[PDB]
Amino acid sequence: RDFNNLTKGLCTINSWHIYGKDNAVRIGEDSDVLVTREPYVSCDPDECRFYALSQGTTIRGKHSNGTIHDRSQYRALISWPLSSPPTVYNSRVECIGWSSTSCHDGKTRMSICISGPNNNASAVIWYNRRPVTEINTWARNILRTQESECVCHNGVCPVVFTDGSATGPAETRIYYFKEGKILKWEPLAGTAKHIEECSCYGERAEITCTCRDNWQGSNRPVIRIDPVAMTHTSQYICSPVLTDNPRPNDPTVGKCNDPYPGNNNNGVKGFSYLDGVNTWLGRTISIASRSGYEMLKVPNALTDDKSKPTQGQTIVLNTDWSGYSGSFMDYWAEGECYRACFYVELIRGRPKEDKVWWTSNSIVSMCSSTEFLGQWDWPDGAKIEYFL
Amino acid sequence: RDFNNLTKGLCTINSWHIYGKDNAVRIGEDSDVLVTREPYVSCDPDECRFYALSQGTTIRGKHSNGTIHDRSQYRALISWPLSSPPTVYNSRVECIGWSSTSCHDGKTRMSICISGPNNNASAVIWYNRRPVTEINTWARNILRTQESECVCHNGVCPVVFTDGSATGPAETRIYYFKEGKILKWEPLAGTAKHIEECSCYGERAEITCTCRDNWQGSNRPVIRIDPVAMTHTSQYICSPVLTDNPRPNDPTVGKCNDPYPGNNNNGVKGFSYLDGVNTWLGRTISIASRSGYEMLKVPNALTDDKSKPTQGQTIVLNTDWSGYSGSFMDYWAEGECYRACFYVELIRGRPKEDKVWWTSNSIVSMCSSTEFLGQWDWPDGAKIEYFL
Amino acid sequence: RDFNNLTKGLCTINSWHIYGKDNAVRIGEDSDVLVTREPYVSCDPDECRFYALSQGTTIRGKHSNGTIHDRSQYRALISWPLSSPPTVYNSRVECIGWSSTSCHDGKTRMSICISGPNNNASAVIWYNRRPVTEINTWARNILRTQESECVCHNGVCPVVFTDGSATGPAETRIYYFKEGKILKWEPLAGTAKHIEECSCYGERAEITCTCRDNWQGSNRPVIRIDPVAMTHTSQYICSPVLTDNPRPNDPTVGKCNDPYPGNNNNGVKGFSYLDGVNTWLGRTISIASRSGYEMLKVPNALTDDKSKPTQGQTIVLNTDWSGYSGSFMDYWAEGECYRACFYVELIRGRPKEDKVWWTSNSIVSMCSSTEFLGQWDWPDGAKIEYFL
Amino acid sequence: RDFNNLTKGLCTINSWHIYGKDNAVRIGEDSDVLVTREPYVSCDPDECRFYALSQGTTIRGKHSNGTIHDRSQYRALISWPLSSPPTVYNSRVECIGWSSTSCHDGKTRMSICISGPNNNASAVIWYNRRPVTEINTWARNILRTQESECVCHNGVCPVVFTDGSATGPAETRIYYFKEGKILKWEPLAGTAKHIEECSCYGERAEITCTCRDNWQGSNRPVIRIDPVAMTHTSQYICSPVLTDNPRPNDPTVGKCNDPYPGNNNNGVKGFSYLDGVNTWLGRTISIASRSGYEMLKVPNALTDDKSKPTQGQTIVLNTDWSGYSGSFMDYWAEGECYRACFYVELIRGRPKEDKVWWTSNSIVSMCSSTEFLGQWDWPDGAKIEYFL
């Protein structure tokens, strides 16, 4: 009933514990599970849920053929109970479209879906499950947003959008929403040169987003937002522990204010928690494909251009498929600190497994522990041969 | 807890944004989706839902054979969560029958289903999910009603019924319900010559219904209802932009008080928003079949017999199947005006696609934006060949 | 929150309107619908539901083979939303067993299931969805009860049980429950000679049950219960309009205090509303099998041994299968009178349709109207050939 | 809203009445039922539910192949409505892992799941459906817990864990949780020599757990816990009525403080109610396999090393498969005493039925009656041949 404020710091991250896993592809082999991609997790004050972009067809359905494609009229933001699969029967549609974000402000939820042709897309902003505001494309080139949850502070929920080229300069804007209405927007500033798919979290009245530089950067750009002043800055993770994909091999020195070069015109959505010595980065294990997943403790990664790992945890083996990854937290949990969480999208099917005509995924997520817990690896678990 | 009153005017309609889409036929290829037709959308104070007439069988079911037929003992008004498909497992039965309307009065919902043989049908009026009033056929020839939501003002919810010929004069009545009980009824008056399937909306204490003249009219008849005085008038859309189907080509001058001739004994359910310069008409793109769908801004369409379009938006391409269309609004949304919405029924199967033995549909709906948003088209999306 | 009292009389029954229909066999041809039999309907203060005895298998399932049998360890009382089918996914288990009754007292629901071998059955009485009281077989021969709803007055809910022979004298008891606990029980008294499967309703502080005399009677026995005094009487419907099945042809004079002879050791569950001139009897149309269903207005049927029909309504054609029938009312509806309702079980499969190895049913129900409504017939609607 | 206290004694157990049965394997032959094992039952103040460890696949699914294995990344604690089957669509995930316990403290529920590799497992303790505490393996050898409900008193919920060898001494700890946080833990004390899979219940401020001595004991070890002092003792059931499996034949004298020998390195989860003369033991009927199930009244079983049965009830015939068994009660029921309940896991498939490639189960549960009720037997009911 009151707006949530980001009054807590991050809990100390000494390891990662299992939080949720839906095993959707394994289950959907013989049940009515929707084809998805671009998943995430997001909490309300009373419940945490899985989110994704449906493809408007089940995996066993004949319409799963062609679901490698990102943008169609048959996609929607859906949510469903934590660690359940996204089924026809339990999935709740938040809005229609092929790019999305969602977050709860303490009173109710804002959800945003973008749809349309590449040269004529529009965002619709829903609040309390009703449409409130619409925003037309400004650069006529795939208006797109975070693909993971936004974050609110005292009713203000900033959102990062990009419109324009994926392979060159583009037009990124930060919109400050309150009750679904635009209070303010700003063009991107600071030293980040290209922004896509920001993964955001909040602590002590500041919002930190780790994004994707698709054009040039194999280091990740970072936007930090003041939701009270409604202003921001941007830079890159200084660390030579490079966290995009594909990427070149790790150097000994990163770049703070420019893209680390070697790979152009590609990338993957990812995240980090940047908190002094309590800093952890996620990356694919493979430098070449969306394969494996690990967390690395890299003290002062944001500001130290020579920072290297001091601790890690494997999440997905390099012999298993990963995908997108992003940040969320339960802002309504008990205790004195916010417990960092993340999910990894485990992509199955095309293009890496082309004996099937579909592309989908399942989800695994973890939250931080102050213990030093033993590690397991967490693969999707399905046998593609079963679908043949 | 208090009855809703129609105290707001329409918001300015500068374009249409995507509101919901269930992709039911695509999904139902490989999941337990009910065969439907005659869908619509209707809001409660806390939730908006999809509605339709079930055929009492799934699409993949063997009993889907013969579902081209309109009236059987196996039909029911069902509702289900917005943008979900109507499945066996999530569909809520409102009442039994093969013609329906439904609306929430601010306190609770009235639903009306008609059933019976052609010469002996009866309406049952449910209120708060209990049967309250029954009305026997008066002309012994397919008692039938709106096939989209009714509208209430201070507890009074008028409903348009017709009984008698589809190809000649018939007996249309306006019933004024309150808490499921008949306060009053009137025979149709004014200059409309035949009435079927009224699509209604409310603003500033007046209810406007755009209907179907099946007998002679390719322009659409309009009934306007005063729910306080419980009186009405009727006429036609004066505009030469003709909105029934099938229809002749558009002339340069319409008819205000008579059917525009050229096509007899056929039609399709449709709608309009008639609000001075803020007037938008829906129509099929094709003059010959239920094919394509567009919105056209036609200032003063109701009263100006030479009014032509000043703006439009394609909703469904002429190379895709459409169907019935109708009006609803979220009367319980925030803000200072009512946002116009509509749905289009996207019919698949018979008679146009006769390699399958069924007829069903999916739903797409839009609401108005005060922005000038880019357009997409929104087809059903299923491949009939998959069902062979 | 207070116990319901039976303070109203019956509404005037001038005809019957459609109330609910699940089309379960049609739907279950291609969806996960449970095999059932012995269905009924029962209301809570906020909701009316369908009830039946599951067979613990779907209709398309291989375990549907053998479901002609009445009593197994795999049966349960289930309930589900009105006019939905009883599916694996929406069916709520009330208790385990192969004979049941259920009713809401205004505060919460009592449900009773009997299970066990023929010579060692026991009833368990649940109240507020917890087990409270148990009753062991007293005659060691299929302890059994109503197979339709019980009725409560000020917290007292009487229930009719029988234990002993189906083809000879047996031991019938009336148990008076309050909050799941036995206040009192009585052995059957009056002139009814054999009692099974009582269909009960309540009005003006009196409960009337129309039952099945399996041993000798083709007229139906009637128990009338005073739930305040906790006493009862019994007799037969005096009317020569005979309402059991199988039965001989109607005579011109019935029997008030003895079984009307001609058919031994068989019958079907049925019901009536006995209310002076406002008296309506249900029966199968066929005298030989569970085929067709009609309602007949038979003024003073209970007390007039020459009473004949003055009005009727066909519910199911004689060319369609029927089955069990029973009474319920919405005791929590608005208005000044209780509206009589009933359901008919539409049995499909064995023994009448033996090309399938299963037996199941769907449900149709009607409530009374004070109008003289036109009639339709309401068959199950499934094609058995589809299941071959 | 207040913590529950164990203020009542056990009701007198004169027999066992049927409480719930899901028939999951029968149903899942033709519906989307999850593969499970290690089930139990547990009540909240408003609802009792079935619980089990999913295998993250349906039974008909191709991924059911290999589900004989106990520990994978695809397992989760799920719960679902009482006597329903665990389906994809109705199952709620409590946490991720391959060993679990769960209990409600009167205010909210604690659930515990352990996951990880054998040498590096960890428990996560959820409370109010959020992760609160984590515990790393202490002996690096399959950290594991009860596989049935825990019990709380004034907010304190003790839990028994074991880590280390299954075939030798191991390290068992009793953790005392309150609101998901560790108040205290103790190493196992008393004369029990090996502890696994404790089945617990509470009465008069004391918690009694009957466990599994896998290493040496065919009598069952017992831990009794004081949740106020947070202290415990342990011993064995003195009775010569031996209740583990496999086991040697019953002797005439048991052992109170040592394992009864004859069978090493194997066992099954089981339970008892130890209450002076009101003492009942469950066991498999077979001494060799998980076959049959009976309850035996064995006065003073705990303390009398010559105690023999005075009464019994067969639950599952020796010609039917059983499995794990455990205790729960509805601590929130009305009345003056706690009614003892239990479930039996009915395992189907491997290793005993190896013509199928899966292993799963269904559930049956009973609660005590103060009547002397007739008995039935309660098999799983599925035909394995149907799955071939």
Ligand SMILES: CC(=O)N[C@H]1[C@H]([C@H](O)[C@H](O)CO)O[C@@](O)(C(=O)O)C[C@@H]1O
């Ligand atoms: C809105 C949209 O189409 N987003 C798509 C993006 C963009 O193509 C890139 O961010 C380049 O801008 O990336 C994906 O293709 C990918 O890499 O898996 C998936 C995603 O659906």
Ligand SMILES: CC(=O)N[C@H]1[C@H]([C@H](O)[C@H](O)CO)O[C@@](O)(C(=O)O)C[C@@H]1O
């Ligand atoms: C999941 C999986 O099998 N990953 C393998 C990948 C992929 O096969 C290709 O990168 C895709 O083209 O290749 C590796 O050489 C790599 O990139 O580190 C090794 C890894 O074992």
Ligand SMILES: CC(=O)N[C@H]1[C@H]([C@H](O)[C@H](O)CO)O[C@@](O)(C(=O)O)C[C@@H]1O
């Ligand atoms: C009650 C009823 O049968 N309504 C049917 C109507 C009427 O036939 C026409 O309005 C003529 O009166 O139109 C349809 O056939 C149609 O055109 O798709 C469908 C609809 O189910």
Ligand SMILES: CC(=O)N[C@H]1[C@H]([C@H](O)[C@H](O)CO)O[C@@](O)(C(=O)O)C[C@@H]1O
């Ligand atoms: C969805 C679709 O394919 N529509 C086509 C229709 C139909 O084929 C017929 O009208 C049905 O008989 O025909 C058109 O000539 C028309 O009417 O404008 C062109 C349009 O492309």
Ligand SMILES: CC(=O)N[C@H]1[C@H]([C@H](O)[C@H](O)CO)O[C@@](O)(C(=O)O)C[C@@H]1O
């Ligand atoms: C408890 C029980 O077995 N009830 C069964 C009864 C009894 O056999 C009769 O009432 C004779 O007592 O009738 C049926 O067989 C029937 O006629 O369709 C179905 C029902 O399940």
Ligand SMILES: CC(=O)N[C@H]1[C@H]([C@H](O)[C@H](O)CO)O[C@@](O)(C(=O)O)C[C@@H]1O
């Ligand atoms: C549903 C149905 O087909 N009913 C028919 C029944 C059954 O075939 C047999 O009674 C069953 O053995 O037979 C009749 O002669 C009858 O009894 O009145 C006519 C009726 O048309």
Ligand SMILES: CC(=O)N[C@H]1[C@H]([C@H](O)[C@H](O)CO)O[C@@](O)(C(=O)O)C[C@@H]1O
């Ligand atoms: C955590 C774990 O693996 N538990 C497994 C246990 C242990 O192996 C034994 O208790 C020996 O410690 O027993 C089972 O194998 C069994 O006997 O059916 C099933 C269960 O899943």
Ligand SMILES: CC(=O)N[C@H]1[C@H]([C@H](O)[C@H](O)CO)O[C@@](O)(C(=O)O)C[C@@H]1O
């Ligand atoms: C369910 C079942 O069939 N149980 C039978 C079992 C099993 O076949 C084997 O014990 C498994 O190997 O064997 C018995 O000799 C036994 O142990 O008492 C008899 C019993 O009838």
Ligand SMILES: [Ca+2]
């Ligand atoms: Ca990049």
Ligand SMILES: [Ca+2]
């Ligand atoms: Ca027309």
Ligand SMILES: [Ca+2]
């Ligand atoms: Ca009889």
Ligand SMILES: [Ca+2]
């Ligand atoms: Ca053992």
